[PDB]
Design a protein around this motif. Structure first.
Motif, PDB file in Angstrom:
ATOM      1  N   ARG A 173       0.891  -1.162   0.054  1.00 25.73           N
ATOM      2  CA  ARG A 173      -0.170   0.109   0.070  1.00 25.73           C
ATOM      3  C   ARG A 173       0.870   1.262   0.093  1.00 25.73           C
ATOM      4  O   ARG A 173       1.625   1.545   1.023  1.00 25.73           O
ATOM      5  N   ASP A 174       0.996   2.068  -1.112  1.00 24.97           N
ATOM      6  CA  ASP A 174       1.746   3.372  -1.338  1.00 24.97           C
ATOM      7  C   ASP A 174       0.587   4.485  -1.342  1.00 24.97           C
ATOM      8  O   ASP A 174      -0.587   4.264  -1.343  1.00 24.97           O
ATOM      9  N   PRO A 175       1.317   5.615  -1.051  1.00 21.86           N
ATOM     10  CA  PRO A 175       0.523   6.999  -0.973  1.00 21.86           C
ATOM     11  C   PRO A 175      -0.143   7.086  -2.141  1.00 21.86           C
ATOM     12  O   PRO A 175      -1.192   7.865  -2.168  1.00 21.86           O
ATOM     13  N   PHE A 176      -0.212   6.214  -3.326  1.00 16.92           N
ATOM     14  CA  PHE A 176      -0.633   6.688  -4.574  1.00 16.92           C
ATOM     15  C   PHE A 176      -1.207   5.316  -5.129  1.00 16.92           C
ATOM     16  O   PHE A 176      -1.707   5.328  -6.273  1.00 16.92           O
ATOM     17  N   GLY A 177      -1.313   4.086  -4.333  1.00 13.53           N
ATOM     18  CA  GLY A 177      -1.772   2.819  -4.795  1.00 13.53           C
ATOM     19  C   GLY A 177      -2.364   2.328  -3.536  1.00 13.53           C
ATOM     20  O   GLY A 177      -1.995   2.455  -2.660  1.00 13.53           O
ATOM     21  N   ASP A 178      -3.069   1.061  -4.010  1.00 11.65           N
ATOM     22  CA  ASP A 178      -3.748   0.003  -3.211  1.00 11.65           C
ATOM     23  C   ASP A 178      -2.934  -1.033  -3.035  1.00 11.65           C
ATOM     24  O   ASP A 178      -1.640  -1.392  -3.549  1.00 11.65           O
ATOM     25  N   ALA A 179      -3.026  -2.036  -2.125  1.00  9.00           N
ATOM     26  CA  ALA A 179      -2.202  -3.339  -1.655  1.00  9.00           C
ATOM     27  C   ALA A 179      -2.304  -4.320  -2.951  1.00  9.00           C
ATOM     28  O   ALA A 179      -3.672  -4.417  -3.393  1.00  9.00           O
TER      29      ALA A 179
END
Ligand code: CO
Ligand code: CO
Ligand code: CO
Ligand code: CO
Ligand code: CO
Ligand code: CO
Ligand code: CO
Ligand code: CO
Lengths: 388, 388, 388, 388
Positions: free
Chosen positions: C23-29
């Motif tokens: 999970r990144d600040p611009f994407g999901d898991a």
């Protein structure tokens, strides 16, 4: 398993590289000046292919027409006595105080004119010595404050200068091309055309863009925290890689200009690979600075280390691409798919393709692993020559 | 002496800006989701001119054709009930796991096709809502390793995608232009076209360059340690400034996306000045993120602060350029000389000019002070509204 | 010539490392959650020595006393069934929104108290599982603005918290030491005690400094453009290297947390050398994040690559120090002289020494070459396993 | 509304500041050398309180005992004729080639001894002129490679040197304290004790830590991307802020040394505030470098701008703290709560407090807004003198 560089390798060095006296902003010269002739012989004995130079490197500033010839004559005999070539030449528009506000973009009009005349003079000499590429590093083109330079107006002056240089060359029927070397900052707070990207875009606005390329430097691009290999790739894609400056840089900070291989080692490996795979034929220039903590013996050891590092990386990169296990990994990552056009079938076809949207299983597509880590470890094992 | 923003100011905000839930790589959401309708009303009451959005911001991913219409209808009524406009729209090609390797440059061909279809779908909606500019931020276009992406091949896919999008628009006779938003890194190790310079150069290789501009972000350029005002200047010079994203950034590090004015304050002042002097008419977009340490009350205060900061800087910049003392200083620095052509007389004339080289007194030219410090202090005194 | 890691190597991994969902600040898991038990078995099969964890990694937040035991029981059986150890444990004072303004330095007093209780609870569990080191990473300790946090007051609260934790441990007679992990920025604009230097200095102000060390991270120090090996050296010199986090970082930017070996390769080589020469016995922790572009298969390949890279570098460093040619080079550079005291003869002696000033030939001393380039090339040839 | 600096302001300047000839790594001197006497008079007329200097700034290197006295005599008369004071003095252990590998940590033992003698000589002169603080900037203490310097051994030599200097001072009964000025890099690849944090920690290992403080520089800390105000706060907390160097720095890059106020403007505001609120009484030193693009007239304008910028910020900071609306905002953010001890009730009390864990409503605590944005805008409005 040694790596002896040969003239065929096309390894070139700048007179200012091994000629650096070691004068830093906080220290004096730790080494005595080297006579251009000596540098040409020492480099030849090391296996270099040739040497490049600034107008002020070969002929001391303010040199009379009589002295000028004398300096050139001696240099010419050295090249003849060694077989060294002069593939590139450039102008020093940064040392002299007169260029404190820039050369081609100086606010003073009289200075800008002088800059063009000083350059043209050298272009003539460059063509006489046999240079094929003329580099232009605008080290003083920029500003320390916001209201000190109108970038819009400056860009106009920059274009005017390059446009004029292109008219002079085409008028003289010279077979020489120009190469702009970008740099983010230093010695100016901010230098115009700070990255390969800004230089490539600015070239597309010149009257004869086909006469201008780019001479990117490993350390320069890294000074902005960019990916040099990626920068070089874009240049090659736009067919503007007329020349290149190799060296080392430890992250973001002042211009170290370390010997090739130093600093970002992995970046160097990927760079050599791209240069070898793309088929770059240009000279492998080395714009480095031997540490001031070293003597004449250290200077030669530093330069030799540059050619050796390139040869070693070149070997590891070749083995990495020729390794079947690697070729199979590239396919597993879909590297081959990235090569196939996206919509070769056209737009209408793609629009009518239900398999691209209406019936596209994104869930299953997203679950596919890229297997990039396995490929990278395979690349790492090859670099460290540890394939197990 | 207050600064009340009005719709005429052209201040726009993205649904994701004040709509940010506060989910960071090391923390969960600190705020509940905001209904697009509420954001459109709150922003209108604050004096905003309009709002922009990603396809996935207005219509939840996987939404049925029935839900889609319903979401659009509600949004449309809000805009009508407030008078807000939708000047720009973009596509979310970074959130969904499917785009883990990119959208237009994903190694998987099937993914690339899906990316184009998802985009085209939104372009249609954007034209329906009245958007004039379509932004494209390739947040997933890049790589974490060297052998994971062939930049040369990737650039081909990037061009193919943009080329196709240009064919679709011209085929539908849509009056909309494209805007590429560059970013150095994050969330990818290295993102393609990392700076305004790389984006401008890449656009010159498109089939219809006249249909592509650039949407630079204050924080993005700063992420590479570059001079945003300088970057914007080059864009304007190349007539590619179709849109702009305002915000704040504290030097080099992750993408803060602070409210406009924050971070580099002086940089903001010089930016506003250039935008006002150049005559930029495009919308003043605000791509910021209200701190997760704030509540709904803090979010509105943050957004209002963005418009207020711009208005304040706009006033100080105007007073700085209208100040005679400043006008006189600009002349003392030769700012007026930088505007005059270098060799309007031509090349031959410049070559025959002895006053440019043969009889050029470099000694006296170099001794001339630039008087840049006095000008900068005058600029500083104006910014701090302390003119004494 | 393969490098199989064994439990004796002391290679440990954090549950959050291979457990990262992506999970990144611009994407999901992009990956499903991993059951702690599965991670303990997979890591054991790979040759790991043990695993570390945050209180919230083993027992889900809000877990009842009944659930708590159940989670611990399962984990305990896994460790028994594999022989894995738990050398270090830490507390999660950054995820939960409650810690949006920090844990130990939160402005809200009630929050600070809760942070201490949550920590103490875990310290007890850590001692039960057999942890020898308790790490504290204040990821939320900082601020995005200037007037949002009084560093002087914050430092007081930070000391108070650590002081209290030291009183609790000594009161319970626990044989566990504390380790502070510094980080320059992210997720906060600026985090307190940003470097190893700030952490070491702050520890000297604690009531019982002998109970606090430092857990530096490769990527963290690099986030500020510092020399990790140099940082580690200072820590060892001050005998505060209680633990260490290995990983990779590509220059200055967001926290990549790449697998060990990645990013700065040369930095990794010098680090391993210092750790092996200094005799570091602590566990070789790996605080990395498998790329979200990889699947479960890629995660395991990434972790294995970390242990392999360390082993390879360890071998090259050993060969580099055992190489006579290198030993001779070290002497040529005067590395042996740097070990001899400057004025063992005392102050008065040095003051009366004319050979140190009055009759000191600085001219001849300055002319001596350091021969650092030759030594570095010898180090480079060893790293690339290319000794010719 | 003008800001005339007076001697009471305690504004000091280094002979090397306005005395900088403008010699950069890529250019020659653009200004003629300034006679120390002239600098002392010009600075006095501007309202300076005093001047600092390096042993090599006042007395040219290699000066005979006869010349030495002569140089000092003239300087002494100037100070008497103006009333200027000499609050700080330092040694030049970086210019001379002899210090190419460092001063106190040079690999050559004979060099290290010479460095100590050269320093002690100046300490004596410093005490004669009335200096209260002796600064030590180890500009050459570091290395460009990994195997060129053993940080562990180097730290030993560094401590030995400082320990000896402390014994000399205490033996002579001199009332002078030492101040270490940290710097991340330049001119060396990596300089020992790169940040305020590393210097503070190293001082705690000295025989007499009470005799050593820290002289942090705005630009230096910023060279590593750190928060100067935060750094200064920690120093004050540890009571080690014996001196400070003010200037400007544009993000991460070479050492600009711009005039105070330039570069990070907001950072300057927060710094002045902390210095004024903490009650810093030390001199307000200015370690800047007038741009080489300026003449003698520009140099004086640059220096004056430094004192003016400080005075302006000092006023805005005072108004910001005295503003009731701001005082109320600080309370809303709980700035007052951060001042109250966490567990003044003790450990046992905190352990038995169910309101801290067992019955702590984290849900409601997390929902509380910090209101940091409103406070920051109030701080911004005050800085720009735009309170509406
Ligand atoms: Co360079
Ligand atoms: Co170069
Ligand atoms: Co951004
Ligand atoms: Co944006
Ligand atoms: Co990390
Ligand atoms: Co860590
Ligand atoms: Co400095
Ligand atoms: Co200083």
């Amino acid at each position: 398993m040694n790596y002896q560089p040969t003239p065929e390798d096309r390894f070139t060095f700048g007179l200012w590289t091994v000629g650096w006296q070691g004068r830093d902003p906080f220290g004096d010269a730790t080494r005595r000046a080297l006579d251009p002739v000596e540098s040409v012989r020492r480099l030849a004995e090391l296996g270099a292919h040739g040497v490049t130079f600034h107008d002020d490197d070969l002929i001391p500033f303010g040199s009379s027409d009589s002295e000028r010839e004398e300096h050139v004559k001696r240099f010419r005999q050295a090249l003849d006595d060694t077989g060294m070539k002069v593939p590139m030449a450039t102008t020093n528009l940064f040392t002299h105080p007169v260029f404190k506000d820039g050369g081609f973009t100086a606010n003073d009009r009289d200075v800008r004119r002088y800059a063009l005349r000083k350059t043209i003079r050298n272009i003539d000499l460059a063509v006489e010595l046999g240079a094929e590429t003329y580099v232009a590093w605008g080290g003083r083109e920029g500003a320390e404050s916001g209201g000190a330079k109108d970038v819009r107006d400056a860009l106009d002056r920059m274009k005017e200068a390059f446009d004029l240089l292109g008219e002079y060359v085409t008028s003289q029927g010279y077979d020489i091309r120009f190469a702009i070397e970008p740099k983010p900052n230093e010695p100016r707070g901010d230098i115009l055309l700070p990255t390969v990207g800004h230089a490539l875009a600015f070239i597309e606005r010149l009257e004869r863009p086909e006469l201008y390329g780019v001479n990117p430097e490993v350390g320069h691009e890294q000074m902005a925290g960019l990916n040099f290999p990626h920068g070089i790739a874009q240049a090659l894609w736009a067919g503007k890689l007329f020349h290149i400056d190799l060296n080392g840089q430890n992250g973001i900070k002042y211009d170290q200009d370390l010997r090739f291989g130093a600093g970002d080692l992995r970046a160097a490996f990927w760079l050599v690979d791209l240069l070898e795979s793309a088929g770059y034929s240009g000279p492998r220039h080395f714009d480095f600075k031997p540490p001031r903590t070293e003597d004449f013996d250290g200077v030669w050891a530093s330069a030799a280390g540059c050619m050796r590092n390139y040869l070693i990386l070149k070997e590891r990169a070749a083995a990495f691409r020729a390794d079947p296990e690697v070729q199979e990994a590239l396919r597993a990552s879909r590297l081959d798919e990235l090569a196939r056009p996206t919509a070769a079938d056209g737009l209408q076809a793609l629009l009518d393709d239900r398999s691209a949207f209406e019936e596209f299983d994104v869930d299953a597509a997203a679950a596919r692993g890229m297997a990039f880590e396995r490929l990278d470890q395979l690349a790492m094992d090859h670099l460290l020559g540890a394939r197990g």
